[PDB]
Design a protein around this ligand. Structure first.
Ligand SMILES: Nc1ncnc2c1ncn2[C@@H]1O[C@H](COP(=O)(O)OP(=O)(O)OP(=O)(O)O)[C@@H](O)[C@H]1O
Ligand SMILES: Nc1ncnc2c1ncn2[C@@H]1O[C@H](COP(=O)(O)OP(=O)(O)OP(=O)(O)O)[C@@H](O)[C@H]1O
Ligand SMILES: CNC1=NC(=O)[C@H]([C@H](C)c2c[nH]c3cccc(C)c23)O1
Ligand SMILES: CNC1=NC(=O)[C@H]([C@H](C)c2c[nH]c3cccc(C)c23)O1
Ligand SMILES: [Mg+2]
Ligand SMILES: [Mg+2]
Lengths: 326, 326
């Protein structure tokens, strides 16, 4: 159909998604794609807010699409496409920036975090708003770190509609609970990110499974020697249970009860072993999709045509409302 | 041909161009269009950096195109088109913003002038750079007030080419001399602009000719009672001679010599009378083009197709260089 419209995206900024991308975003997408009209985007225009190697940016664009498919995104149910192939994104982004307070974009966390900012680092939340609003998106499945961004997208949509009623769908932010943050393994306070310097706390989907298992087995826990889920008091330990729960389907309580009398060594064992079991089918699927790119680029080609059909209607509806000559 | 490529634009922010637009920009375009490949744009995407009435924005978009034709732009020689109908502008603008220093865009005069800025008020110089660079533009005919903007366009083009040699043409800024500033008549210090509050110092092309002549006859001169061209010491008086010279074809020296023994009353007489003679053929042409819009919208339609053919090649060349999957 075209109801319960969903939109979400990941940047092709690296050679692998990490567990946070896969559990905190892409896993939700796979549940949702059955009964939602879903658009899943590789957002390459966002990638170049930071300098990118061209051969790498292209290779990583395809690899990010491939990890979508290997994680279960289904091209028969959903639409996968590359942001830069749909001009409507930047068109709407220009418009939306005209309804976006400068201070409103200054107070955005990553701009506070730096401010050698560029205009692109400053305005990318506006382009993110156009990414979502261009597809009449009803819900946006993202992790917790994307919430402030999408309240800007909602506010600008409401500011625009106040002048032009009924023009843009105001999206609901759909954020998970536990998996909403997979934490670094060497620092279970901050999120597992591609920006914490060392890959040591970072579990990449496509890394060497024995290497990821080694990082898990080396994870920072605490001293209580009690396996119990409490993210404040037990950062490392709750993260690992969160990880093991997410890649297995077992609730955390059923896990914590099965861990009565067990130690933290047993906890890392099983989590590593389940992660390895999780990533190996992914890597096999990714390897074939990289070696046989017909499938993957047909998907992207069908996705881009479908995205353009939708997104360009939105842009002309906006343009008409603004008074542009069409 | 396709050599000596020219690009320039005016915002459809009002119901009339004023003498500054017509003498400081559009008159240069008409001289240039004979031996230059020229693209002349109605830049409506810039207009909405400030709230615009939709019925007015559309009507003024066409009226600005029409004043181009009534001032002598020739659709057989040049290309006239509406900015918003060519998606490449915002596409390139997103890219260029990633190569544009935040401080570099902060130091831009109009942002200093305000800073309730929006993102659009902050980033419009970047979109202006994409407007020009998207057409492999060799020269940009503009008045003196657009110089700081186009040094940003040149710098960003050079910053981009440093990473990707040979990708973007670096445009030369082509600025006139005398007409490079037509001044307000009630304040011959500052430029005649649509933003000085009172239309009283403002000569609109399409205003009532007797009203414009009245404003001229009421112009602030000085006390020397000597007709001589010196813009510092003689602000009002040099402006009027500048105006009369520009709308007649007579050099200022030939004028000043013919004004030996004459007073300032005679100076306003002739300038008003020559302006009236200038604007009446314009208004007749504009009136027909508004009443018979077939011609005008065929021009814009041919222009937009030609602009898209050029501008989209630039964008794909840029995208390829960046490493986007095409
Ligand atoms: N540690 C994490 N836990 C859960 N979700 C995450 C995590 N990191 C990112 N996400 C989610 O992944 C999606 C895309 O994130 P993004 O592409 O910015 O990756 P990232 O890990 O933040 O990389 P980068 O440091 O390059 O920004 C969003 O829905 C975001 O909420
Ligand atoms: N007073 C002026 N004298 C000479 N050229 C001018 C003058 N004002 C604008 N121009 C030229 O007209 C072109 C477009 O100007 P623009 O569309 O910004 O008009 P404007 O008069 O500045 O109106 P606004 O106040 O809405 O910006 C540019 O090439 C600019 O240099
Ligand atoms: C640097 N650019 C950027 N950093 C982010 O955190 C967002 C994000 C990747 C993003 C861009 N477009 C989107 C559309 C829907 C959902 C999301 C998460 C996004 O963009
Ligand atoms: C608010 N926007 C804006 N204020 C300006 O002064 C420029 C200008 C109208 C502009 C936009 N695009 C252009 C391309 C070529 C030449 C010029 C003069 C322009 O834009
Ligand atoms: Mg991020
Ligand atoms: Mg201006």
């Amino acid at each position: 159909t075209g109801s319960r419209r969903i939109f979400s995206g990941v940047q092709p900024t690296s050679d692998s998604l990490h567990l946070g991308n896969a559990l905190g975003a892409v896993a939700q997408w796979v549940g949702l794609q059955d009964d939602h009209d879903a658009f899943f985007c590789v957002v390459d225009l966002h990638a170049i807010t930071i300098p990118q190697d061209p051969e790498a940016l292209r290779r990583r664009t395809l690899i990010t699409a491939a990890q979508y498919l290997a994680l279960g995104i289904d091209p028969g149910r959903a639409t996968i496409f590359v942001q830069s192939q749909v001009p409507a994104h930047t068109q709407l982004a220009w418009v939306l920036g005209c309804f976006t307070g400068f201070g409103q974009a200054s107070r955005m966390t990553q701009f506070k975090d730096k401010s050698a900012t560029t205009v692109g680092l400053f305005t990318y939340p506006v382009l993110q708003a156009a990414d979502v609003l261009a597809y009449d998106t009803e819900l946006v499945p993202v992790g917790e770190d994307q919430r402030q961004h999408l309240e800007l997208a909602r506010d600008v949509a409401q500011r625009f509609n106040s002048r032009f009623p009924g023009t843009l769908v105001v999206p609901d932010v759909l954020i998970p609970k536990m998996t909403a943050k997979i934490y670094d393994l060497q620092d279970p306070t901050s999120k597992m990110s591609k920006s914490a310097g060392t890959d040591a706390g970072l579990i990449n989907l496509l890394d060497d499974p024995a290497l990821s298992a080694k990082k898990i087995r080396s994870a920072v826990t605490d001293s209580e020697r009690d396996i119990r889920y409490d993210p404040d008091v037990k950062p490392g330990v709750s993260n690992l249970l969160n990880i093991q729960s997410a890649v297995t389907g077992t609730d955390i309580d059923v896990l914590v009860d099965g861990y009565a009398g067990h130690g933290y060594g047993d906890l890392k064992k099983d989590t590593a072993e389940a992660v390895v079991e999780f990533v190996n089918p992914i890597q096999a699927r990714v390897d074939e999709l990289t070696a046989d790119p017909a499938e993957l680029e047909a998907v992207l080609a069908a996705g881009a045509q479908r995205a353009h059909d939708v997104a360009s209607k939105t842009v002309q509806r906006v343009y008409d409302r603004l008074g542009f000559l069409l």
